From Swiss-Prot, chain A:
Subunit organization: Binds trophinin, tastin and cytokeratins.
Protein's name in the database: Bystin
Location relative to the cell: Cytoplasm; Nucleus, Nucleolus
Family under the similarity heading: Belongs to the bystin family.
Comment field (misc): HeLa cells lacking BYSL show a delay in the processing of the 18S rRNA component of the 40S ribosomal subunit. HT-H cells lacking BYSL show trophinin-independent signaling through ERBB4.
Gene source species: Homo sapiens
Tissue specificity remark: Found in the placenta from the sixth week of pregnancy. Was localized in the cytoplasm of the syncytiotrophoblast in the chorionic villi and in endometrial decidual cells at the uteroplacental interface. After week 10, the level decreased and then disappeared from placental villi.
The protein's role, per its UniProt record: Required for processing of 20S pre-rRNA precursor and biogenesis of 40S ribosomal subunits. May be required for trophinin-dependent regulation of cell adhesion during implantation of human embryos.
Coiled-coil spans in chain: none
Disulfide bonds: none
Curated annotation (Swiss-Prot), chain B:
Domain Protein kinase: 9-277
Oligomeric and partner information: Interacts with the Axin complex. Interacts with TUT1, leading to TUT1 phosphorylation. Interacts with FAM83A, FAM83B, FAM83C, FAM83D, FAM83E, FAM83F, FAM83G and FAM83H (via DUF1669). Interaction with FAM83H recruits CSNK1A1 to keratin filaments.
Gene Ontology molecular functions: ATP binding; protein kinase activity; protein serine kinase activity; protein serine/threonine kinase activity
Modified how: Phosphorylated by MTOR in response to mitogenic stimulation, leading to its activation.
Full protein name: Casein kinase I isoform alpha
SUPFAM superfamilies per the UniProt record, alphabetical: Protein kinase-like (PK-like)
InterPro entries hit by this protein: CK1_Ser-Thr_kinase (IPR050235), Kinase-like_dom_sf (IPR011009), Prot_kinase_dom (IPR000719), Protein_kinase_ATP_BS (IPR017441), Ser/Thr_kinase_AS (IPR008271)
Swiss-Prot record, chain C:
Similarity comment text for this entry: Belongs to the eukaryotic ribosomal protein eS17 family.
Residues of the full protein shown: 3 to 83 of 135
GO cellular component, one term: cytosolic ribosome
Subunit description: Component of the small ribosomal subunit. Part of the small subunit (SSU) processome, composed of more than 70 proteins and the RNA chaperone small nucleolar RNA (snoRNA) U3.
Keywords, sorted A to Z: Cytoplasm, Diamond-Blackfan anemia, Isopeptide bond, Nucleus, Phosphoprotein, Ribonucleoprotein, Ribosomal protein, Ubl conjugation
Organism: Homo sapiens
Disorder association: Diamond-Blackfan anemia 4: A form of Diamond-Blackfan anemia, a congenital non-regenerative hypoplastic anemia that usually presents early in infancy. Diamond-Blackfan anemia is characterized by a moderate to severe macrocytic anemia, erythroblastopenia, and an increased risk of developing leukemia. 30 to 40% of Diamond-Blackfan anemia patients present with short stature and congenital anomalies, the most frequent being craniofacial (Pierre-Robin syndrome and cleft palate), thumb and urogenital anomalies.
An annotated GO BP: ribosomal small subunit biogenesis
Chief location category: cytoplasm
Protein name per UniProt: Small ribosomal subunit protein eS17
Record localization: Cytoplasm; Nucleus, Nucleolus
From Swiss-Prot, chain D:
Compartments where found: Nucleus, Nucleolus; Nucleus membrane
Record protein name field: RRP12-like protein
Highest taxon above the source species: Eukaryota
Tissue: Weakly expressed. Expressed at intermediate level in testis and ovary.
Similarity annotation: Belongs to the RRP12 family.
Portion held of the full protein: 119 to 472 of 1297
GO cellular component, one term: cytosol
Keyword Phosphoprotein: yes
UniProtKB keywords: Isopeptide bond, Membrane, Nucleus, Phosphoprotein, Transmembrane, Transmembrane helix, Ubl conjugation
Gene Ontology molecular functions: RNA binding
Length: 49, 297, 81, 331
RNA sequence: AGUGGAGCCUGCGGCUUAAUUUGCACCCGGCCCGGACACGGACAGGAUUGACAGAUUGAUAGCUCUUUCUCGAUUCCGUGGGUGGUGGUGCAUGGCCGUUGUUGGCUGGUUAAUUCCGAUGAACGAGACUCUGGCAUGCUAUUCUUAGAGGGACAAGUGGCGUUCAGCCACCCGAGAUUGAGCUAACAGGUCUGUGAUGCCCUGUCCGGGGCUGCACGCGCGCUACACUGACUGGCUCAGCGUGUCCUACGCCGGCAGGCGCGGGUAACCCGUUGAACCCCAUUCGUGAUGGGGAUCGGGGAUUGCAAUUAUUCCCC
C-alpha cells in the first residue's frame, strides 16, 4: 500500500513525509533481509518525491 | 520457555492481583516493550473478562485509559494484556510514610475529577473506586493518572433513549465499604452521585490519612458494613474536615444532595478547585511528594 | 538374540535334505554343518548349528508317523540316485 | 456459566445448604413454602423449589418424616392431582422424585405408594423414567410388593407400547416379589409370549434374565416353580437361527438351571440332559455366535453345577439310576 | 452356429441443420462487468451515486426505455503497437505433516431400552547394521614378549512366566551368556503466503427455449424372423451366480398395466423349498406372405418425473 499509494502521485503533506522518513529512521540497524519490494517502495518514493 | 502468551510476549513475575484475575509482568519478544498481564481461569466463579475487554475498547482514545494491546485464550486461561503502568495511589501513600499535603491532594483531586468526567461521558459507572484502583503512568505519562479494573463496572445510562437503569433497593456491596456511599450501603442503585461521593471519601482518606471507621470489627461482614453505615450517618459532614478548607466539605454537601437523573456541572467543581489552588498560591508544576522524595533520595 | 531370514531358510532346507544324518545336541549339529555345508563364516556356522539344534529339540517330541515317512521318502530319494 | 460455579446448585447446595441454620436438617423451609405450593402455578418457581426439596430431602430427618408424613402425603398428593390436571413436566418430575425419597425414608402409605406407582404409564419419558426409578428405589430401600405386582399384572391385562414399560418395571422388580405373585407374573408373561411381537419377547426374556440372575431365595422362588418354568420355557426355542431371541432363551435357561441346581442339585442334574440335548441340536445352527454361546453356557454349567457334586454322585456305569444316569444321558 | 439378405436399434463416415457438441462440450435470445500511465477534452454554473411508479421483455429490471428527486469530487470521455495484472506457467528457495512399543484413565425434549440428538487425563522404555575382545601351556619362526592361522559361544544347559510357540526373567558351568569401534539420516508423497526489480505466453457467470443423429447413402456390431425339428391354448415339472432400505411376502379392487392397507428383511434368518424359460404331455392349425413375422400407424387407460409435444415406459383393441 506504501508503494501503490506513492504511485498515486498526489500532493503529499510534509508531515506525512516526515512520518515516512521517520519509519526509515526506524530502519537503521536491523539485520533482517527486507525484500526487493522494500527497494521498490524506496524507488517509487525517490521517483515521485 | 515455560509459557508464551500471544506468540510474541514472554511472561515474567507477578506484580499484583486484580478483582477478577492476577496481574503479571511480561516483555514483548519482538520489540522489547514491557506490558502488564491480567490472567483468569477459564473455569471459575466469575467469567467477566470479555465484558472487561468490551469496557476497555469502549473507553479508548481519551486521557486516563491505558491503550489495549491484546486479548486471548491460553490453554487453560483467558489473558488480557495491556500497557504497563506504575504503582497505585496506596503504594505512594505507604512510601510517603502516611502523609499528604494540600498541593498533592489537589493534584490528585483534579486528576480524579477528570477521570470521573471521562468515565461518565463514556456512559459507565465504576462502583469500586479506591486508591488501589487508580494507577500512575510511566515514562512521559509520569504526570498522568490512569483508571483501570472495569470488572465491577456496569451501564448506567443509554445512548439512544436517555434512560437510566431503573431504581430498585437491596443491592449487595460490590466494592469496598471504606469508600462506599450511604446509598450504596443501603442498597440504593448506584449512580454518578454515589461515584463522586466515593471520590470525596478517597479525598478525605488522602487528607486525614486515617478513617474513624477504618479497622472496625463486628460479628460478620454484613454487620461490619451496617455498623459503618449508621456511624456514617452519625458522623456530621463538617467534623470530618476540621482544620481543613471548607471546599471539601461543601463538595461533599453538593454531591450528597444530587438527585438520580440530574447532570452535575463538573466545570463548576473544577473551577472551584482551581480557585482554591490559586488562592493558596501554588502552580501546576507536578512536584508531588513521592517525586520530591525521589529527588531527595 | 533374533535370527535372520537366511539362517532359518538354510536350516529348513538342510533339514529337508539331510534330517537322517543329524543328531540332538550342538556338538553333532556343528560337526555335520562342518562336513555337509561349505559355510565359510564360522559365526553363521554356529548360528545354523544352534537353530538346527532347536529344530531337533522341537521335532522328536512330535508324532513318529511324519518323521517315519520322511525317512522312507529320503531313503527312496537316496536309493534312486 | 452459572451451573458450573461451585456456589451453584451443582455442588454446594448438596453439601452446605442441607445444614439449614447450622443444623441438618429442618423442614421448616418446606413448612414455610406450602404457600408457594398452594394457589400458585408459576413455572420455574415451583420447579426450582421442588428441585431443592428433592436435593435436600435425602439428608435423613427421619423421626420428623415419620411425624409429619401425613402432612407431606396430603400436600404432595394435592400437588400431584393439580399438576396432573394442569399438565407440566419438571415440577411433576421432581415432585415424583421427592415423594420417592420420602417413601424410601419411611394404610395411607399404601395410597401414597399407589399415587407414585400410577404415573409409570404416563406417556412423557421424563415422568415415566422418574416414576420407575423412584418405585425401584422405594422397593429396594417388603409389604408393598404385592400391591405393585398386582398393579403390573392388571396393567398388562388391560392392554401396546406401555406393555414394554411395565415389563421394564418387571425386569427391575422381579426379585423383590413373593412366590405366588412371581407365579402369576410368569403366567401373564407367558400369556404375552402367546403373541408373536418381537420387542415384548426380548424385553420379557430380559426380565427372566434379571429374575434368575439375582439368585432369589426360597421365599421368592421355589424349586418346584423353577422346574415348572423350565419345562414351560421349552415350548418356544424360536426357530433354529434367529440369534437375537435364541441367545436370550439359552441365557435364561442357563440361569434357571443354575438356580435350580443351587436350590436342589439332584433335580437340576435330572433336568440337565434335555437342555444339553437341545444345546447340542442348537450347535447345528449356521451362526457362530450362538455356537460360542452354547459352548460357554454348557461349560459354565459343567464347571459350576456339575463338577463339585461328583464326589456325592460317585462313579457312573451303564446301569445307573439316580443323577448318575442323568450324567450318563447328557454325556 | 452364423453375419453379409429383410424389419428395428445402434457405431463411425456422409447428407440436412441455428445446433444436430466432442476426441452439456453445441445453437437461438437476455443480464452482469471490462486497467493504470501519458496527453487532450467535460466537471461545483456541476462530475457522478441511489431510486418509487409505468413499459420493453419469453418474463422483471434504475442491470435497460420514460418523467424528475436526490449523492456530490468518492470524477468520466478519447487516442496509444508504451507497458501491463485478482492472469497461466518452471527453476533455486525457508518452515510444517505423514512416512521409511508398554501400562493406566447431565437443564431439555426423545425411545421398549444407560435409545436419539442436545450442553459437557496420564505416565514407562526404546541401535535387532558391519567388524570384534577376555581363555588358549594347541600349529607356525613359541610355557614369560611377539604375529599369521586354527579353536572356543551357539542363548548352548536348568527352573519358572508364557497363545505352550515367539519371547521374558533368574541361575549353574564356562575366560567370555555381551566389552569395544564405525554407522543422526531421507522426501521423485508433499504441504504451507516467503525469498530472485526469476525465464516464458496473453491483457467468464447466471436465466429461458432448442439440439444431442434429425436420414437419400457407404462401411460394421447387434435383436426378431423367414415357420411343421413350428405357432397357439391348457396341463405338468426342474436351477445357479448375485443383489436388496428398496427387495418384497400376504389381504382387498380392477380384465391389464396399476391402486390401497398391513408385515419381514442392514440379510445363508425375508423375498426364497428363488414353483425360470427352453424342455415334457394333450388341443387347434395344414404349405397358404397363412393362426409364420412383427415393423409402422389409429383410439383409450395407467405409471415415473417440476416437465413426456418430436411418440420416457407399460397395458388393451
Amino acid at each position: 500500500f506504501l508503494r501503490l499509494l506513492l504511485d498515486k502521485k498526489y500532493a503529499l503533506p510534509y508531515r506525512v513525509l516526515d512520518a515516512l522518513v521517520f519509519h526509515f529512521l526506524g530502519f537503521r540497524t536491523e539485520k533482517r533481509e527486507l525484500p526487493v519490494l522494500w527497494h521498490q517502495c524506496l524507488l517509487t518514493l525517490v521517483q515521485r518525491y | 520457555a515455560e509459557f508464551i502468551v500471544g506468540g510474541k510476549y514472554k511472561l515474567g513475575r507477578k506484580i499484583g492481583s486484580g478483582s477478577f484475575g492476577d496481574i503479571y509482568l511480561a516483555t514483548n519478544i519482538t520489540n522489547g516493550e514491557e506490558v502488564a498481564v491480567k490472567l483468569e481461569s477459564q473455569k471459575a466463579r466469575h467469567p467477566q473478562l470479555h465484558y472487561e475487554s468490551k469496557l476497555y475498547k469502549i473507553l479508548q482514545g481519551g486521557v486516563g485509559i491505558p491503550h489495549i494491546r491484546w486479548y486471548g485464550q491460553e490453554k487453560d486461561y483467558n489473558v488480557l494484556v495491556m500497557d504497563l503502568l506504575g504503582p497505585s495511589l496506596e503504594d505512594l501513600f505507604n512510601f510517603c510514610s502516611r502523609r499528604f499535603t494540600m498541593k498533592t491532594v489537589l493534584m490528585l483531586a483534579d486528576q480524579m475529577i477528570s477521570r470521573i468526567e471521562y468515565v461518565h461521558t463514556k456512559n459507565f459507572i465504576h462502583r469500586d473506586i479506591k486508591p488501589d484502583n487508580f494507577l500512575m503512568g510511566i515514562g512521559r505519562h509520569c504526570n498522568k493518572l490512569f483508571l483501570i479494573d472495569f470488572g465491577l463496572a456496569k451501564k448506567y445510562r443509554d445512548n439512544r433513549t436517555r434512560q437510566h437503569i431503573p431504581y430498585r433497593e437491596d443491592k449487595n456491596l460490590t466494592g469496598t465499604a471504606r469508600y462506599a456511599s450511604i446509598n450504596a450501603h443501603l442498597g440504593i442503585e448506584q449512580s454518578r452521585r454515589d461515584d463522586m461521593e466515593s471520590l470525596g471519601y478517597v479525598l478525605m482518606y488522602f487528607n486525614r490519612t486515617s478513617l474513624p471507621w477504618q479497622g472496625l470489627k463486628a460479628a460478620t461482614k454484613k454487620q461490619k458494613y451496617e455498623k459503618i453505615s449508621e456511624k456514617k450517618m452519625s458522623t456530621p459532614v463538617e467534623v470530618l474536615c476540621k482544620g481543613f478548607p471548607a471546599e471539601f466539605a461543601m463538595y461533599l454537601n453538593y454531591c450528597r444532595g444530587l438527585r438520580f437523573e440530574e447532570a452535575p456541572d463538573y466545570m463548576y467543581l473544577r473551577q472551584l478547585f482551581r480557585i482554591l489552588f490559586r488562592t493558596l498560591n501554588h502552580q501546576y508544576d507536578y512536584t508531588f511528594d513521592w517525586t520530591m522524595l525521589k529527588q531527595k533520595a | 538374540r533374533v535370527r535372520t531370514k537366511t539362517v532359518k531358510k538354510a536350516a529348513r532346507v538342510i533339514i529337508e535334505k539331510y534330517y537322517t544324518r543329524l543328531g540332538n545336541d550342538f556338538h553333532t549339529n556343528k560337526r555335520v554343518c562342518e562336513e555337509i555345508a561349505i559355510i565359510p563364516s564360522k559365526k553363521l556356522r554356529n548360528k545354523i548349528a544352534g537353530y538346527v539344534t532347536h529344530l531337533m529339540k522341537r521335532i522328536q517330541r512330535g508324532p513318529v508317523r511324519g518323521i517315519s515317512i520322511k525317512l522312507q521318502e529320503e531313503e527312496r530319494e537316496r536309493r534312486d540316485n | 456459566a452459572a451451573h458450573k460455579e461451585i456456589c451453584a446448585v451443582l455442588a454446594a447446595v448438596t453439601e452446605v445448604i442441607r445444614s439449614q441454620g447450622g443444623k441438618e436438617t429442618e423442614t421448616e423451609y418446606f413448612a414455610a413454602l406450602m404457600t408457594t405450593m398452594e394457589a400458585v402455578e408459576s413455572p420455574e418457581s415451583l420447579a426450582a423449589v421442588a428441585y431443592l426439596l428433592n436435593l435436600v430431602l435425602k439428608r435423613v430427618p427421619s423421626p420428623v418424616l415419620i411425624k409429619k408424613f401425613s402432612d407431606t402425603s396430603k400436600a404432595f398428593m394435592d400437588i400431584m392431582s393439580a399438576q396432573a390436571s394442569s399438565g407440566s413436566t419438571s415440577v411433576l418430575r421432581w415432585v415424583l422424585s421427592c415423594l420417592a425419597t420420602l417413601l424410601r425414608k419411611q394404610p395411607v402409605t399404601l395410597q401414597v405408594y399407589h399415587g407414585l406407582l400410577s404415573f409409570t404409564v404416563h406417556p412423557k419419558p421424563k415422568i415415566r423414567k422418574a416414576a420407575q426409578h423412584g418405585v425401584c428405589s422405594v422397593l429396594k430401600g417388603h409389604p408393598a410388593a404385592i400391591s405393585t405386582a398386582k398393579f403390573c399384572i392388571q396393567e398388562i391385562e388391560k392392554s401396546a407400547t406401555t406393555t414394554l414399560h411395565m415389563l421394564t418395571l418387571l425386569k427391575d422388580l422381579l426379585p423383590c416379589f413373593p412366590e405366588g405373585l412371581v407365579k402369576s407374573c410368569s403366567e401373564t408373561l407367558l400369556r404375552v409370549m402367546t403373541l408373536s411381537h418381537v420387542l415384548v419377547t426380548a424385553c420379557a426374556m430380559q426380565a427372566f434374565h434379571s429374575l434368575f440372575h439375582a439368585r432369589p431365595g426360597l421365599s421368592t422362588l421355589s424349586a418346584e416353580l423353577n422346574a415348572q418354568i423350565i419345562t414351560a420355557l421349552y415350548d418356544y426355542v424360536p426357530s433354529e437361527n434367529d440369534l437375537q431371541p435364541l441367545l436370550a432363551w439359552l441365557k435364561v435357561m442357563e440361569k434357571a438351571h443354575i438356580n435350580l441346581v443351587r436350590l436342589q442339585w439332584d433335580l437340576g442334574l435330572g433336568h440337565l440332559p434335555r437342555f444339553f440335548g437341545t444345546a447340542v441340536t442348537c450347535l447345528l445352527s449356521p451362526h457362530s455366535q450362538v455356537l460360542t454361546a452354547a459352548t460357554q453356557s454348557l461349560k459354565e454349567i459343567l464347571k459350576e453345577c456339575v463338577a463339585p457334586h461328583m464326589a456325592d454322585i460317585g462313579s457312573v456305569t451303564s446301569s445307573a439310576s439316580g443323577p448318575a444316569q442323568s450324567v450318563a444321558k447328557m454325556f
